[PDB]
Design a protein around this ligand. Structure first.
Ligand SMILES: C[C@@H]1O[C@@H](C[C@@H]2C[C@H](O)O[C@H](CO)[C@H]2O)[C@@H](O)[C@H](O)[C@@H]1O
Ligand SMILES: C[C@@H]1O[C@@H](C[C@@H]2C[C@H](O)O[C@H](CO)[C@H]2O)[C@@H](O)[C@H](O)[C@@H]1O
Ligand SMILES: C[C@@H]1O[C@@H](C[C@@H]2C[C@H](O)O[C@H](CO)[C@H]2O)[C@@H](O)[C@H](O)[C@@H]1O
Ligand SMILES: C[C@@H]1O[C@@H](C[C@@H]2C[C@H](O)O[C@H](CO)[C@H]2O)[C@@H](O)[C@H](O)[C@@H]1O
Ligand SMILES: C[C@@H]1O[C@@H](C[C@@H]2C[C@H](O)O[C@H](CO)[C@H]2O)[C@@H](O)[C@H](O)[C@@H]1O
Ligand SMILES: [Cl-]
Ligand code: NA
Ligand code: NA
Lengths: 344, 344
């Protein structure tokens, strides 16, 4: 078990449009993009990329701008589909083999090779990668060992080393990392302790330190960080308080101030934000209303505003965004979305 | 034309850990640098320290995809020389020669595969270039030519689809450009003219909506600009007025609104900015005071605030930044800087 997941994967595209990906009642991947690179732009509407997926689909922007969606398939292998060019159509769904047991986690190495991390049948962390930048063919799968109990999350350090996080068998946050950029040489697994009851959410701060967010045993929102840019030692666990009934989402305001979002005990969107600057103390929790049935997903848009997405009581994706003063009334992008996360 | 508007005095970069760090040439012809202590507006500065060398161009810093800074400059023997941090944000190597014979300041960008590629004018007046053979690493490739005959320092930027594109003034004084036909490629297009008459180095940026847009001073000494019509497509040349006595400097506010800077006829800092949003109209020119003896250098710091550097009447480097309402008063970072620009 883990706190209620995010219903969609979202990306700010190379032309500054938000674009959201989720699973339909039919088990296919569907997407929705902004027309215009602005807060409040009209949306395309939901359209199908087809496939039949058995995990959350996860979008990533290749270093040449082209989106690529990863999702577990009906055969439990990793499959993908990618734009043929930045403002063009899509490929056919294609298989990368393997047998996996979590949602895929994706990051681009410093050399532009996308690297995919996913849980195995053995419950280890496995990985596979592009052989050259933003392009097939891909490597063979190999394992990074471990025994993990959540979906993994990956983020690049400010020195180019990929680093992967997942819950362990003791329910602590565990991590593993590249010892050199673009490398196949990884550390051992190391515990960062704690007790976590959601997927980790990982952020690179403005000052170059990995910060992990997670729900605790008390259902508060807790966070732990690197104390030095791309380096240990780590901090201790620190509570941001709150009582949250979903997974948290975290993103950066345009001034780099972190801002955490989560479903509350009342099923509204609540948030807490850094005050003053990117190294300032956190607000108290405040409500952004609505009644939501997934964790929120947050993203900064091409106007430097945070937009937050969440499923509604009618199973459609709803949207609220920052304004000069406040936030905008909930609006509906329509659709009917399922939670297809491969671990719940 | 054998002249261009007064060049920038330093080259600025956002460090891997989010600090501003400027590089210039002292009276001994060595490359010197200064950085902020902490990544906030109005942080104290380290003071100037020497990386030695003897340079006959402006030194141009670029950040590798692993976070290590690397400084490029023409040497006393007209070869391209370089010096790099041997570990992200830590110590520096010795200067080494990349050979070649060049006649401009060097222009640098990362390919989508992490390989830096350096462009500069040759002895034969054509555009030459060289690159790292693997991501953020030597050895370097052979020098090669993209032909052309150019009369300004070249400017390189990457398209929103990963193709590098280089801009330089031609022998008819028009803006000319030439581009990669694929990312990471040695395949380029032919040279093409964007017409106009330019009296400065071109300055190039990527808009939030993924368009290359080039600013340059014109024949009437106004700031002009031109752009790609669609992401990685040009428009006509449009004037932004002013009478400017230096090269311009463009940077993005945290909401992505462009803002241009340049020295006035009264030798003060002037600015004009996009209003409302990043597709908004351009304000009229306003003074930021000060008396400057170079073109300004503009950059967004980790507080989402714009900071502008310019040499002063005393030859020190001076600084003013955006506040909540206005701009801070000009302050001196000291040092004694010269214009070592290979083309003036
Ligand atoms: C994600 C994948 O979706 C499907 C791939 C299908 C493969 C076929 O060439 O095109 C279809 C749509 O026209 C795809 O949907 C499944 O068959 C596969 O097993 C897996 O679940
Ligand atoms: C993620 C972690 O994986 C395992 C760590 C193991 C720790 C040991 O030093 O090396 C093994 C393989 O070389 C790891 O698999 C679990 O024992 C641990 O409790 C936790 O779940
Ligand atoms: C996210 C929020 O966290 C909770 C706790 C918050 C706990 C903190 O110590 O004080 C705040 C102000 O009194 C509370 O709002 C709930 O009150 C609320 O229903 C929601 O779940
Ligand atoms: C940029 C370079 O700077 C100098 C490099 C020097 C190379 C020497 O071995 O060590 C010195 C450090 O104290 C450097 O300054 C010039 O000799 C060279 O010709 C070139 O102009
Ligand atoms: C940048 C441009 O370089 C030259 C373009 C030339 C155009 C010609 O047809 O092909 C040559 C070989 O590649 C180019 O060198 C100049 O003649 C032009 O005036 C301008 O300065
Ligand atoms: Cl001088
Ligand atoms: Na969501
Ligand atoms: Na490239």
């Amino acid at each position: 078990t883990i706190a209620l997941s995010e219903i969609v994967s979202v990306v700010n595209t190379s032309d500054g449009r938000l674009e959201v990906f989720g699973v339909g009642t039919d088990k296919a991947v569907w997407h929705n993009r902004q027309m215009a690179p602005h807060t409040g732009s009209p949306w395309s509407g939901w359209s199908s990329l087809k496939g039949q997926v058995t995990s959350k689909p996860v979008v990533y922007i290749n270093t040449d701008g082209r989106l690529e969606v990863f999702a577990r398939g009906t055969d439990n292998a990793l499959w993908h589909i990618w734009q043929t060019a930045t403002n063009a159509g899509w490929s056919n769904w294609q298989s990368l083999g393997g047998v996996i047991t979590s949602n895929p986690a994706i990051y681009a190495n410093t050399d532009g090779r996308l690297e995919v991390f996913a849980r195995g049948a053995d419950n280890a962390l496995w990985h596979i990668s592009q052989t050259t930048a933003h392009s097939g063919p891909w490597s063979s799968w190999a394992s990074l060992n471990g025994v993990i109990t959540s979906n993994p999350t990956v983020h690049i350090n400010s020195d180019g080393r990929l680093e992967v996080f997942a819950r362990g068998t003791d329910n602590a946050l565990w991590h593993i990392w590249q010892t050199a950029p673009d490398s196949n040489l990884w550390s051992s697994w190391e515990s960062l302790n704690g007790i976590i009851t959601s997927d980790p959410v990982v952020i690179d701060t403005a000052d170059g330190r990995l910060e992990v967010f997670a729900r605790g045993a008390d259902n508060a929102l807790w966070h732990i960080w690197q104390t030095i840019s791309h380096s240990g030692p780590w901090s201790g666990w620190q509570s941001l308080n709150g009582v949250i009934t979903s997974a948290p989402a975290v993103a950066k305001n345009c001034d780099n101030r972190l801002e955490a979002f989560a479903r509350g005990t009342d099923n509204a969107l609540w948030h807490t934000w850094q005050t003053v600057s990117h190294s300032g103390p956190w607000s108290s929790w405040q409500s952004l209303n609505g009644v939501i049935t997934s964790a929120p997903t947050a993203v900064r848009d091409a106007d430097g505003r945070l937009e937050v997405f969440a499923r509604g009581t009618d199973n459609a994706l709803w949207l609220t965004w920052q304004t000069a003063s406040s936030w905008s009334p909930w609006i509906s992008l329509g659709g009917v979305l399922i939670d297809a996360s491969a671990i719940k």
